[PDB]
Design a protein around this nucleic acid. Structure first.
Ligand SMILES: Nc1ncnc2c1ncn2[C@H]1C[C@H](O)[C@@H](COP(=O)(O)NP(=O)(O)OP(=O)(O)O)O1
Ligand SMILES: [Mg+2]
Ligand SMILES: [Mg+2]
Length: 430
DNA sequence: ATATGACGCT
DNA sequence: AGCGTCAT
């Protein structure tokens, strides 16, 4: 009771760009704005693969990993932008650079952990504290929170979305104990005020809109973010968790979206996150291991301790390309030529990285997939990365994978390769 | 024929 | 080290 952990020590946010690659293309081409549109990779095979979808297009049922020709059947007006292709492969430079625009703005407010090309976690605890001392006793106006939803509100004793949003915000703000500078609810609220500012600054300075979640940990923050996308932010309080988790499918929670989550469901015979509470920590550990049981026990009560890692820059720099179906590489010449293509892009980005972030990669990981094998990687090998030179890197990469070739004929490659992947890792200061 | 990046397990 | 899991 009086010694029970409640996981309310931190204020953490997750900011995620709304249909990010689409916004990047739409900024550059005003014709795409306010229109159903998608970003497509390649063109030949069925119009190309869709990897990002505007919300206008989503209303038609257009989704990621849909072929462009199929998307057009759902949405004939659909506008497309193609990913740049360089040396026969997708070149994502424009989105990486757009990403850096956003991460630099967020970094001004607090420490961020880059979690993907289009999202970062923020530890706002310190900023909230200071903002709270600069704002002693001053009540928080709803005007400071113009795009914020309070999850679970309004409750108890209007038919418009914005009307609902405001009612809940009013109920929340009326109930706040403003004199207590250690109230977790107040802290979150102040956290939300800062995130409004962060999000205003991102949009002012990039043109890009985003959503955000504000809570006490990463998992709740990430979950919160998705509840009112696009162009809105959501506060998930500790108190909101029992009802939210009561009908929350286990798979929605970060890290439970795969086999572990399926296993939780299967072995325990449950569906929703809240149902985990009726198990002891030891029961959970016995089914899912010491680490997982401990984590599940706390998480189903809204408690999670994974820290926001102070890291704005990726730890590996990588290049990959699949070679599906008929296009699978089957000669030594093909393999070597594509290793060179991959290595050349990698060199470009490594060189850029060394100038920009004052570090040098020191290990090259080569990964291939072979025909028939469904795993992401059939095989990973590594060598030293001593010189930022594509020819050396590609030759080195061939060297450490060439014995994977089961072919009697020297000019042929079997089994055929369906993926090549070069990844520079183990960075050192420079 | 669904380009990358982080991390856990052994 | 090399593979497995989960993610955008
Ligand atoms: N499986 C994948 N494969 C290739 N590219 C991908 C990808 N998933 C995402 N991308 C690229 C394309 C995406 O634009 C970008 C961010 O991914 P999200 O945040 O998951 N989705 P978005 O920001 O588009 O929409 P919203 O957040 O509003 O739901 O990463
Ligand atoms: Mg996004
Ligand atoms: Mg994202």
């Amino acid at each position: 009771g009086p010694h029970m952990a409640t996981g309310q020590d931190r204020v953490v946010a997750l900011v995620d760009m709304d249909c990010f690659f689409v916004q990047v293309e739409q900024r550059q081409n005003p014709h795409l704005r306010n229109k159903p549109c998608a970003v497509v990779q390649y063109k030949s095979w069925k119009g190309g693969g869709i990897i990002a979808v505007s919300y206008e297009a989503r209303a038609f049922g257009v989704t990621r990993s849909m072929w462009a020709d199929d998307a057009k059947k759902l949405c004939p007006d659909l506008l497309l932008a193609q990913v740049r292709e360089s040396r026969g492969k997708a070149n994502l430079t424009k989105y990486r650079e757009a990403s850096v625009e956003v991460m630099e703005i967020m970094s001004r407010f607090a420490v961020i952990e880059r979690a993907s090309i289009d999202e970062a976690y923020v530890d706002l605890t310190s900023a909230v504290q200071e903002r709270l001392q600069k704002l002693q006793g001053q009540p928080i106006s709803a005007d400071l929170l113009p795009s914020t939803y309070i999850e679970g509100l309004p409750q108890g004793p209007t038919v418009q979305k914005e009307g609902m949003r405001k009612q809940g915000l009013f109920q929340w703000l009326d109930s706040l104990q403003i004199d207590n500078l250690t109230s977790p609810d107040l802290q979150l609220t102040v956290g939300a005020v800062i995130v409004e500012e962060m999000r205003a600054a991102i949009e002012r300075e990039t043109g890009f809109q985003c959503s955000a979640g504000i809570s006490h940990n990463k998992v709740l923050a990430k979950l919160a973010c998705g509840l009112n996308k696009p162009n809105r932010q959501t506060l998930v309080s500790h108190g909101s968790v029992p009802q939210l988790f009561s009908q929350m499918p286990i798979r929605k929670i970060r890290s439970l979206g795969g086999k572990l989550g399926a296993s939780v469901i299967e072995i325990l015979g449950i569906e929703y996150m809240g149902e985990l509470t009726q198990f002891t920590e030891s029961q959970l550990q016995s089914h899912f291991g010491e680490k997982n049981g401990s984590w599940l026990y706390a998480m189903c009560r809204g408690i999670e301790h994974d820290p926001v890692k102070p890291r704005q820059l990726p730890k590996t720099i990588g290049c990959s390309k699949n070679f599906p179906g008929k296009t699978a590489l089957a000669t030594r010449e093909q393999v070597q030529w594509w290793l060179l293509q991959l290595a050349q892009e990698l060199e470009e980005r490594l060189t850029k990285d060394r100038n920009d972030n004052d570090r040098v990669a020191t290990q090259l990981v080569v990964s291939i997939r072979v025909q028939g094998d469904k795993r992401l990687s059939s095989l990973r090998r590594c060598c030293a990365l001593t010189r930022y030179d594509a020819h050396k890197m590609s030759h080195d990469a061939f060297t450490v994978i060439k014995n994977c070739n089961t072919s009697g004929i020297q000019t042929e490659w079997s089994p055929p390769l369906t993926m090549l992947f070069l990844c520079a890792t183990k960075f050192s200061a420079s």
